[PDB]
Structure 1
């Protein structure tokens, strides 16, 4: 009985195995744009993915991860609300069964068709493992996806999904440039939160971009052909792998603009 997104193992069940699910800084959250306050103490956000080196793509049964080689100082996120350098380790998405839902964070309660998560770990902690043991161990750059024009830079990811249809499958995925998934503006909202899937650790500084990227109906449709199940098992389409908004509690969302 592994955690998932179904009625008997979904988000409302997670707290049993992971009590932190009802924690004080859980993610995602709804972003009330009117209550969010401009923070002049925020430094310019810096996304340097020019030297990024992807290695593999994996269907972990919850989503698919494009993993990067993070053994060296390459692909880093810094500035903004961050202190120090955060290194990119992987990115994945959360999407719905329909265009009307799929994102984890919401803006004034609006749900986007999907949400891209670029995961980074604070380099002062040595590696990802030790980082997730710190309050400021991770930084996730979230980008909303809406259905409209295709995103050229996402097609290579879309075309390899057929090779990792089921849980546990992975494929080589080198030379993929994540810069092709970024919108024009780096305007963002930021707040302290957690991983949105078990173990739901509260080590994340969330940076959610205001400008969403557009993806075609065809592209998101292929995301929906993936499977939660493993090869040879009954097919359960990988859709609606998002956690709903959680209580903001004692937190303030800051705006960079």
Structure 2
């Protein structure tokens, strides 16, 4: 089944998910010089002060931190959105080396990792209905560069030991997502897809201009995770990112 390896990685995905060859696939290259500055873009409203994290899980592709999304606790509004989009989970894509790992690139430059805070449009009642819709999800993507440590990421890094293999989970309450955000909320937005199967074209992508930096020690621990379940041969979870897709008749708008 799908993965990121030679025999089941992104170049084979079209065989089970034909939408891989679609018209608004993600990620894309953000070419900063032809992104259209649009002055009617409102600022982002990120309200993560009441967020409830419940769990972290290694799902054999990445590890996810899930949040309680049954009431409007952590929401995203503003920006290019019309509607309140509720936080359900966040995860990352990262590389085996520091010069690769982001899915989106800025002027063909790749970062060491990328954070995806996944939200779904509440108009649609549950997550599973929102993925049937062209404006069902909004994913806020944040690039991570290697540098000094991000204090807020360390709590996540300490637990990775209990979720080393496919299928392990640990309770992970009281995590505040606000410590993973950059100072600036300037962005680029465009319509796209999930970057993993089923590759659905539901997503408004809001990629932030400003990256966060994390130490090389923090991102090192990401790399010690496993794609396999326990008892199966060890296969390190690295380079779990999809390469950039053709923009083909889409315009990237800039809020700045």
Q: Name the TM-score, length of structure 2 as normaliser.
A: 1.00
Q: CA deviation digits over 1:54-104, x for unaligned, max 9?
A: 000010000000000000111000101000100000000000000010000
State the partner residue of 1:121. Answer: 120
Cα shift at 1:41 = 1.5
C-alpha distance in 2 between matches for 1:39 and 1:22: 28
State the partner residue of 2:41. Answer: 42
Partner-residue secondary structure (3-state), 1:207: strand
C-alpha distance in 1 between matches for 2:235 and 2:176: 30
The residue correspondences of 1:94-173 to structure 2 (distance < 5 A) are: 94-173=93-172
C-alpha distance in 2 between matches for 1:232 and 1:212: 37
Q: CA deviation digits over 1:98-128, x for unaligned, max 9?
A: 0010000000000000000000000000010
Q: CA deviation digits over 1:122-160, x for unaligned, max 9?
A: 000001000000000000000000000000000000000
- The answer to which of 110-119 and 36-45 deviates more is 36-45
Q: CA deviation digits over 1:174-216, x for unaligned, max 9?
A: 0000000000000100000000000000000000001000000
C-alpha distance in 2 between matches for 1:227 and 1:106: 25
Cα shift at 1:250 = 1.1
C-alpha distance in 2 between matches for 1:3 and 1:51: 36
Cα shift at 1:44 = 1.3
Partner-residue secondary structure (3-state), 1:130: helix
Partner-residue secondary structure (3-state), 1:143: strand
C-alpha distance in 1 between matches for 2:247 and 2:195: 14
C-alpha distance in 1 between matches for 2:126 and 2:207: 23
Aligned residues: 256
Q: CA deviation digits over 1:209-234, x for unaligned, max 9?
A: 01000000000000000000000110
Runs of 4+ aligned structure 1 residues displaced above 4 Å come to: none
Partner-residue secondary structure (3-state), 1:250: coil
Q: CA deviation digits over 1:7-35, x for unaligned, max 9?
A: 11000000000000000000000000000
C-alpha distance in 1 between matches for 2:66 and 2:73: 13
Q: Please, what is the CA RMSD of the aligned residues?
A: 0.4
C-alpha distance in 2 between matches for 1:225 and 1:235: 10
Partner-residue secondary structure (3-state), 2:19: helix
C-alpha distance in 2 between matches for 1:219 and 1:235: 21
Structure 2 stretches lacking a partner, 5+ long:
none
C-alpha distance in 2 between matches for 1:247 and 1:9: 21
Q: Name the TM-score, length of structure 1 as normaliser.
A: 0.99
Structure 1 stretches lacking a partner, 5+ long:
none
